[PDB]
């Protein structure tokens, strides 16, 4: 069964490096494009990350230039999200996701366990 | 040139049917030509076979003993003769397709009684 | 009341899909002199002169939904794989290497390596004195001293040598319809990527597209005949690829100095490795020359073309997004050896002073890098090795198209890069029977 | 720039009612809809403006051609409480929630 | 499969089911193991081509029946019309004449040539 | 092999035995070596199909194309009694594409009906 | 000493059941082709032949 | 009764580097393995 498994969250100090890993369980990871989004209480949720894992194509949203990075390891079938210079506003649940079909690269089908990010201000 | 007939109505195309039939006939990586050759030959053989089954081989057009019905088409002589480009009429009759297939077998057999 | 008939030879169409087969010229054993991509099995000679314009032929085209490009890609990858099937396997090389930098900006890039190897007698060992590129060697665990290295591949997969006479630049190769099928070519110059075409022509066989290989740019292609053309699945669907097809070419030349020399290295009975033996010259690393500020002019035209389709979000340009090295850098295989170039200088600058301005000053330079080991087709695990070539290697090419995303140069797919060429054409079959009054 | 304004902000309805949520776009595209229960992963509900997604009953429906799209949820099951998000490929809005009256 | 229904019946019933048998005779519906289908396709096509060719050599294509111009000998089968037509079933008659197979194969190339002395 | 006997004879005797040539013209794991028998059979079948196709497009056969004497002025008796087939075949072979063509038009003139 | 081959190339063994004397093997024309045999015993390597079978 | 059927085996094996060696700790069923000549100790 296709499934997205998320690692544990992080409860670290602001102004720190933050890292998350998500594995596409039970699927050919190389072929389909994953994505990252944010969900928080009462927040206009936001699109974070792109990853076409075959060639490792990447692009970033407007607020995330430079700060946000991710990469992939095809052998591990795991996408590694990593944020630089953590801040209080980054507090949100993060989902590694997928679209209904691997034809268009958008995220409205699959969702992980929602590993949370908490900023110990 | 037969594609030139595609870009014209029925009357002009009627004088150029033969050339289409003429052209219709003819590293393990390179072995794939055999499939294309076999399938093209099979399509041609299906054509000749089915021409046989109408009792209408040799002749390109044949007086074959089934009638028409207004349900399959009501549009008249003049429209189909002059104005009508081939693909549109082919699509219109294709709405029926299999029902406008069928019966000529027993008509071949009627003349074969 | 008018009674039934059968036409034969009806000129009508059905949008069928089938396996195309190509036609290509040939002159010798390796498809003209040497071969990678050509295949004489696709027969000579060019049957393209069979061409005809047709009246009133309104037909739809869709390059995004084209399928024969996929079959052609399958053909290329299968041919390339079976070409490398007989060549040598470099498994024995993966032994510990005691290494250092060069003997004496500069080719300190080179890592000098000495290692043990077996002779033709299976039980006798000898030392060696070899040179390798830095990115093609991984140091062992840093808990041990970093002077020891290994080949990158053997932690993951095997290796294979590239045969010497199997080396070839892309040939124009024509894709030809089999009997009963036909190829429809759209001729309207303003083709919008998909939709009806009115000046449609038909050919027994199509243009001799070259299987060119390059990342982030289209080179040695066929220019457009209108002004610079834009094609996309849907522009407002921002995160998809946009392709740009140039109407005027731009020249790029790539070179590395030095009378570099290779040496064969006997590794077991009946095969030899080709290591780089020495570098002889100033050997300023792999700089490439761009045709002066003609790029400065061309970006103006591209910006105007993009601005035509969209409201006034001011157009500008940016470095590659990142990701893997092959996506980070423009890549190509002109000299047999593979080249990679940081394209930051291409996309820097935003303002009209260098985007509504034109002049001829001096060739723009790109920092570049050389590699041997490569997973050829965009990371798929055909881990293979290319040998070095003697010095004074040089290349020349004409740039013809670009790849972009939407709200940066894109990485792209080589299948997509060829699909950018095959938009002209479509496949169809004949249905020779019908009825009338 | 919110180019998907879900309205009304929230609804307080007893079970079995028919909930309606409007979403207004201004750019051509596909309006799908999300839903997540409190503390649970989201699920696709409506796709392409009117079509139900997989495993979604006939309770949910949508429309229409034009810039305004009206989600509808007949026979409000309490399990369908929680937040929703109007969405299409490159667009989603602020989100709206349904709760007990 | 209806053509086999005539195999289970006498002569007259099979007299109309000739075409349905003819229709299906032509065609029907790592792993390099599967290309033996091409052998089968080639062999079936060759059998059909042999049938059409041989019909050609009688000068009797298009028709399934043709007024061929040769003697007949009771030595091959002396039995009367009614038994061979009414009571008979096809496999038995085919077995009976099969004894004379090459004794009922041969000439009519020359018969075609005979009426082709003026054609 | 009898048809080659007609090859060694003039027009008259060979006219009696043209059919035998047509009869013979049609047919007669680790070792993938011998697979090219398949494509050989395919090519032979294609040659036969080409023969039948050309026969069809013409509609022995009372056809209607004339014959310019420039291609051959030699009289009736020569090409019945004296003439061995290879010689006359070579003689007309000089005009091959000059004498390939209008049988399709001979079909077309009767396709006017 | 050493084996001669390994300075230049590899080696292979001959299988035991793969052993065979020259068999008379015929060569047959495919359909549409024919084989022409000259019978003149004084054949001079090339030229016309009269008793062709 | 119990997995005395199973035999614990330890052995030398090569790493990805062709010349280096490491020991292992593996399990195999009895019928899938055979002891060497009994003149040597049967533990091998």
Author numbering:
A (entry chain G): 1 to 52, 52A, 53 to 82, 82A, 82B, 82C, 83 to 100, 100A, ...
B (entry chain F): 485 to 510, 533 to 619
C (entry chain E): 3 to 106, 116 to 418, 431 to 460
D (entry chain H): 1 to 30, 33 to 91, 96 to 107
E (entry chain J): 484 to 512, 532 to 621
F (entry chain B): 484 to 511, 531 to 561, 567 to 620
G (entry chain A): 160 to 212
H (entry chain I): 116 to 159
Which passages does the manuscript contain on this structure?
The HIV-1 Env is a trimer of gp120-gp41 heterodimers that are heavily shielded from the host immune systems by N-linked glycosylation and further protected from neutralization by conformational masking and considerable sequence variability.
Based on these two early intermediate resistance features, we selected Envs from days 358 and 526, having both G300 and long hypervariable V1 loops of 18 and 28 amino acids, respectively, and Envs from days 836 and 949, having both N300 and short hypervariable V1 loops of 11 amino acids, to identify structural hurdles to DH270 antibody interaction. Despite poor sequence similarity, examination of the V1 loop regions of each unliganded Env structure demonstrated a structurally conserved hydrophobic core and variable hydrogen bonding and/or salt bridge formation that ensures coupling of the V1 loop to the V3 GDIR/K motif. The d358 Env V1 displayed considerable disorder in a portion of the loop with flanking hydrophobic and salt bridge interactions ensuring the loop remained closed over the V3 GDIR/K motif. The d836 loop displayed a kink in the loop near the V3 GDIR/K motif leading to somewhat greater exposure of the motif. Together, these results indicate a shared role of the V1 for protecting the neutralization sensitive V3 GDIR/K motif that is mediated by a conserved hydrophobic core.
